Ligand binder design. Structure first.
Ligand code: ANP
Ligand code: MG
Lengths: 296, 721, 200
């Protein structure tokens, strides 16, 4: 049961990269899945459905006109325009896979992305000032989406899993996503419905398979999948966000996952990876693979 | 051994040209026989018989390196003695900009005038060569790098061919270096093929010489570092500026070490390194099975090293394509296609950057890593009490030394990690000598030292201009001494510049008829020397610290007025050196002295990106609204508007900054009525009539009101207390 | 788990200058939405001001302050009950300012008479114009039902102080007087009842 979930962000969102100052347009599937797991823990919903039957996709830009998908990593025959290009609309995706898109069209597509404006809010901490100290400046990156634009993701799962996802997303609307939530960022409203265009696009058979989420194969299937594969091993890491994990904030075990848009000739079913060591509970890093087939 | 003699002969095969212009082979043999060390049979025979006619009559042993030198000269090449060296930019972008006539006079700029090198200048070069060869230079396996450096320092602006019919873009040094590289590759290929008799398959049948041209014996090998720009700016502010000055240089020196390691594994000199740009290194290697095995082992070792040290932050991908002599000679139009294939293989290597075992080891972390460094943000490596990683601490410690000293040392013990279980450090001459003595096979890179004479030293161009370091007090102040202004607003200007369509210039700037390894290598050398040495020459008296200057990217922080003025001067000198053709677009930002370095760099990068947008060759000064052309900013603003306003304000005894601010408010109000109020203010101002009319006309029209606003802002910034 | 939505307006009783350039221009421009350019109140500023005022009232290391506004101390990790989103320039106030053709932000000229030379140093500070209303959205999290009444009493005290104490800016010199109007208090998530709960 594929469900497209669109998110319109009332407030600017951090979605920070490794730096707090750094701001990203979107977040990977692991971040959204961690948010869902946190919400399920708060809402006291069972995690079996999310861990087993739920397959989500990296949040992707969408404008007033089209929905954007990550640029597939395929051989192309003005390479700089393609390299700077990051997201391709749904209709142009098949054309890009076939290779009909040229450098001028690639630049036009990259300019067509009207997701939002990235800014760097400058803030201070006055906690030290009371204690005979000095204010500490810091910077929080943010990405203010244009009113029609937002972030969408496809979630595939069982009907019960889809309903639990609906409840979790309804709660996450007010919980928020990304960084510096509960400090004025990350608030959004989500609308989840069946998407005809994505249901048709996913129901395709092609010689190549494109990752729609930050995923990583298990050690048994990596040998099969990695052959003839064009990918981008993105470093996913960070600190654990929970109250019961440890007395203090502890970094997650460093993880490396194939980025969205990576093309594999042989598909692999991703695995929920545990990146928690010496903690009271387990930290789930979502690396389940959402695949889109295509012909090149 | 024999290869050493062949390299010495090939690098000196056309040394006879200089003495003849003061034939190319008959006199060069005598000149080299004058010196005892170079009187070796392999060298003098290579010099004397590198021409086909002399080789026909040569009484050799059918296995002398002279045939290899002759065929290498033929591949590299494929009669006024006073003819000058034509600049590479004469043919670069000749289809669009045109075919200029700029030539180099006897770092130097092409002057476009008609100049002929006098025989007296060639004689002076001849006695310089005699003094260097007789006493300073010597023949040895470790001394050939000194020979190459000496050739680079002398023959860099000597025409390869006196023939005025063909273009004289390729210098004597470039031609000799390419000939030496080709000779080394061909010697290795023949040794692999067990070619005991060179004459049989090289010279004696002309058809077999043509076949050897068609035979695939060379390897165009490109190694590119990925993650460079991320690595440089993967920093926190705490010492960002230092790291900003260091990391780039680090990713420079490390890269050089890389190629040297490769050239150490193939037993080839720096001549085979065709050209190194920003993170890219293109080399010409033999097609031997040993060469390919060395390339594979080197790729595996360097991937392992980068995974061990920087994990996925940095990587190096090296891809090779086999080619024939025809491909290097651009026959059949496959040279550009050859480089296209090399870069396509490089991109395919980039896509599949890691293997199965490496990915599994990436994901098979044992512990969380608890504390992490501030800059690298990595917990796998041990982190000191200062929350700095060992590599990060090494980079920070390097920064100052690399800014001060001049001898980089790849020693077993040093500051920052380098590939083959060594560390880069920066010391003076005495420190470099001590490092050489204590540990043998230790590489020394001399910064901005064309001087030859040190056998175990390779020259390494690097722009390290820092006005604060001129005085110890200003060095202690740092960038804060730049805002130490008794007059003018204390601010730091940040300039970030990038060449526009430089990649296309290397790809398709040179026409098909002029495409060659020699010409592209010459262009790369000139660009690198401009952005390393000539960039330092341009910024001489300015209060500017060059944080880094790559192949095309340049980032420097200094006094705002000095930064703007030197950006204009740099644009003018770039136009002079590139003879039109290449242009660059820059972003200039004004910030307070205590403004964070990361914020200044980010905002200036945004300004430069906006300047690149649309029409290139533009500078984005201060706010984004003020994107102007280089000629527009230099003349239409400062000369046309700012200077007359300064003259009027300094001459008028009844005017001051208040009048300027009133003008600025009227110009920025933009209510369509403030034109009349500005006219009224000018009428009551008792200013110059011509200046009053000029100001009114500039205000009445767009694209000139903004320039007048920019001029007024510049003036009021300049005349601050 | 319950989530209580608190939607209301912040009325600028005196020009609000949150802040956070060109010569002879506003050297301290207020924070604005990067796209719409409308001045906004960062949720960080509201949260910090409320936390500081409630800390002064309680006296931060107090358990109420840590639970309400989040804590990351060793052994004390507490999710912030109060998620105070950025207050945005309300559409009604935007229309009111478009009528009469009034700028959303005023440039207030101030100076600095020194004690030594008696000379004046001028500044042009941007302030959100008086009479502007910001739509503020806050989410309260019910981690413990028993603590909800005490937490809402603390929020009421903080809101009263923030109605008496300026919001971000040089409020001791007048810049930042605000008034809170609580339009609605609803429980978006959960079965909790917020009818009795009142911020003011
Ligand atoms: N040491 C350096 N300092 C400054 N600029 C550099 C340096 N090395 C390379 N550059 C510039 O950085 C740009 C490319 O750098 P780099 O990040 O390596 O991109 P890349 O080669 O395409 N690798 P990647 O971006 O990961 O695909 C070019 O404009 C270079 O001139
Ligand atoms: Mg560039």
């Amino acid at each position: 049961v594929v469900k497209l979930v669109k998110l319109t962000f009332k407030s600017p969102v951090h979605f920070g990269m490794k730096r707090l100052s750094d701001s990203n347009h979107t977040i990977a599937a692991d971040t959204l899945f961690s948010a869902l797991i946190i919400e399920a823990l708060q809402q006291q919903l069972e995690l079996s459905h999310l861990l087993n039957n739920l397959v989500i996709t990296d949040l992707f830009p969408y404008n007033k006109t089209s929905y954007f998908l990550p640029k597939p990593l395929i051989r192309i025959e003005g390479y700089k325009a393609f390299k700077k290009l990051t997201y391709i609309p749904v209709e142009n995706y098949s054309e890009y896979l076939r290779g009909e898109i040229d450098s001028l069209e690639a630049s036009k597509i990259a300019e067509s992305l009207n997701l939002g404006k990235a800014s760097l809010s400058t803030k201070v901490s006055l906690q030290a000032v009371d204690h005979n100290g000095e204010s500490e400046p810091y910077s929080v990156g943010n990405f203010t989406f244009y009113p029609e634009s937002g972030l969408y993701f496809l979630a595939k799962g069982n009907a019960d899993t889809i309903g639990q996802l609906e409840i979790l997303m309804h709660a996450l609307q007010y919980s928020g996503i990304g960084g510096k939530r509960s400090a004025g960022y990350g608030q959004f409203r989500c609308t989840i419905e069946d998407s005809g265009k994505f249901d048709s696009l996913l129901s395709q058979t092609g010689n190549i398979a494109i990752l729609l989420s930050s995923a990583m194969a298990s050690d048994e299937e990596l040998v099969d999948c990695l052959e003839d594969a064009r990918y981008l091993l993105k470093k996913r890491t960070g600190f654990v966000q929970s109250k019961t994990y440890a007395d203090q904030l502890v970094k997650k075990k460093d993880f490396y996952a194939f980025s969205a848009g990576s093309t594999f000739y042989q598909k692999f079913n991703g695995k929920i990876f545990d990146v928690s060591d010496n903690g009271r509970h387990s930290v789930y890093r979502y690396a389940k693979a959402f695949w889109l087939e295509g012909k090149i | 051994n024999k290869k050493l003699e062949l390299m010495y002969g090939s690098l000196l095969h056309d040394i006879g040209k200089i003495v003849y212009r003061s034939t190319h082979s008959k006199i060069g043999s005598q000149f080299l026989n004058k010196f005892k060390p170079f009187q070796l049979s392999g060298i003098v025979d290579s010099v004397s018989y590198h021409h086909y006619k002399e080789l026909a009559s040569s009484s050799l042993l059918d296995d002398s390196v002279a045939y290899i030198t002759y065929i290498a000269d033929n591949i590299a090449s494929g009669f006024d003695k006073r003819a000058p060296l034509a600049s590479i930019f004469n043919v670069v972008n000749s289809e669009t900009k045109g075919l200029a006539n700029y030539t180099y006079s006897f770092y130097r700029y092409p002057t476009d005038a008609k100049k002929e090198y006098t025989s007296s200048q060639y004689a002076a070069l001849v006695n310089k060569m005699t003094d260097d060869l007789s006493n300073k230079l010597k023949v040895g396996p470790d001394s050939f790098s000194s020979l190459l450096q000496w050739t680079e320092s002398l023959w860099s602006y000597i025409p390869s061919s006196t023939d005025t019919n063909q273009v004289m873009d390729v210098s004597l040094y470039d031609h000799s270096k390419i000939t030496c590289a080709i000779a080394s590759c061909i010697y290795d290929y023949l040794t692999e093929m067990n070619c005991v008799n060179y004459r049989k398959e090289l010279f004696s049948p002309y058809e077999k010489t043509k076949q050897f041209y068609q035979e695939d014996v060379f390897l165009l090998v490109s190694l590119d570092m990925s993650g460079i720009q991320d690595f440089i700016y993967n920093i926190s502010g705490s010492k960002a500026l230092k790291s900003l000055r260091s990391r780039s240089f680090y990713l420079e020196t490390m890269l050089e070490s890389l190629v040297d390691d490769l050239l150490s594994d193939l037993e080839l000199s720096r001549a085979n390194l065709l050209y190194t740009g920003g993170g890219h290194a293109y080399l010409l290697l033999p097609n031997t099975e040993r060469a390919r095995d060395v390339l594979a082992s080197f790729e595996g070792e360097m991937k392992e090293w980068f995974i061990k040290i920087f994990k996925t932050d940095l990587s190096v991908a090296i891809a090779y394509k086999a080619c024939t002599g025809e491909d290097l000679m651009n026959s059949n139009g496959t040279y550009s296609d050859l480089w296209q294939t090399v870069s396509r293989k490089l991109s395919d290597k980039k896509a599949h950057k890691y293997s199965l075992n490496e990915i599994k080891l990436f994901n098979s972390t044992i512990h969380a890593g608890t504390q992490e460094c501030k800059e690298c943000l990595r917990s796998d490596i041990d982190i000191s009490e200062d929350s700095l990683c060992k590599i990060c601490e090494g980079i920070i410690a390097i920064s100052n030394d690399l800014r001060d000293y001049s001898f980089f040392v790849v020693s077993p013990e040093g500051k920052v990690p380098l590939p083959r279980n060594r560390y880069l450090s920066v010391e003076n001459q005495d420190g470099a000598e001590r490092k050489i003595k204590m540990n043998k096979e230790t590489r020394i890179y001399s910064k901005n030292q064309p001087f030859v004479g040190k056998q175990l030293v390779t020259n390494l161009w690097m722009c390290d201009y820092d006005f604060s370091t001129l005085n110890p007090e200003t060095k202690k102040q740092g960038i804060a001494s730049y805002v130490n202004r008794e007059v003018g607003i204390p601010r730091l200007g940040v300039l970030r510049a990038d060449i526009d369509n430089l990649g296309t210039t290397f790809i398709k700037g040179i026409p098909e008829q002029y495409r060659s390894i020699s010409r592209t290598a010459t262009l790369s050398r000139q660009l690198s020397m401009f952005f390393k040495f000539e960039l330092s020459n341009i910024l001489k008296g300015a209060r500017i610290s060059v944080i880094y200057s790559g192949g095309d990217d340049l980032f420097l922080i200094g006094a705002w007025d000095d930064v703007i003025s030197k950006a204009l001067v740099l644009r003018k000198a770039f136009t002079r050196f590139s003879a039109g053709k290449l242009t660059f677009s820059a972003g200039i930002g004004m910030y307070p002295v205590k403004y964070p370095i990361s914020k200044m760099a980010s905002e200036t990068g945004v300004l430069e990106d906006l300047a690149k947008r649309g029409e290139k060759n533009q500078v984005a000064l201060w706010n984004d609204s003020k994107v102007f052309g280089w000629s527009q900013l230099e003349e239409q603003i400062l000369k046309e508007k700012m200077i007359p306003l300064q003259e009027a304000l300094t001459n008028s005894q009844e005017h001051g900054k208040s009048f300027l601010y009133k003008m600025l408010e009227l110009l920025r109000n933009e209510d369509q009525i403030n034109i009349a109020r500005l006219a009224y203010l000018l009428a009551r101002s008792s200013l110059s009539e011509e200046l009053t009319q000029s100001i009114f006309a500039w205000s009445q029209n767009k694209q000139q009101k903004v320039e007048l606003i920019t001029a007024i802002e510049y003036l009021v910034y300049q005349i601050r207390e | 788990y319950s989530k209580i939505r608190i939607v209301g307006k912040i009325d600028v009783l005196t020009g609000l200058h949150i802040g956070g350039s060109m010569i002879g221009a506003i050297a301290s421009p207020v924070v604005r939405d990067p796209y719409s350019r409308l001045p906004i109140i960062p949720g960080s500023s509201i949260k910090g001001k409320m936390r500081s005022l409630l800390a002064k009232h309680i006296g931060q290391d107090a358990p109420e302050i840590l639970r309400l506004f989040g804590s990351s101390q060793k052994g004390a990790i507490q999710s912030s009950r109060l998620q105070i989103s950025d207050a945005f320039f309300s559409k009604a106030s935007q229309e009111e300012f478009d009528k009469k053709d009034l700028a959303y932000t005023e440039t207030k000229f101030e100076n600095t008479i020194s004690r030594l030379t008696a000379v004046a140093n001028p500044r042009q500070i941007e302030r959100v114009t008086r009479g502007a209303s910001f739509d503020f959205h806050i989410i309260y999290n019910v981690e413990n039902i028993n603590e909800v009444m005490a937490d809402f009493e603390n929020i009421k005290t903080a809101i009263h102080l923030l109605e008496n104490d300026y919001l971000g800016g040089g409020g001791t010199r007048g810049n930042g007087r605000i008034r809170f109007v609580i339009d609605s208090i609803d429980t978006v998530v959960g079965d909790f009842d917020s009818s009795n709960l009142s911020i003011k």
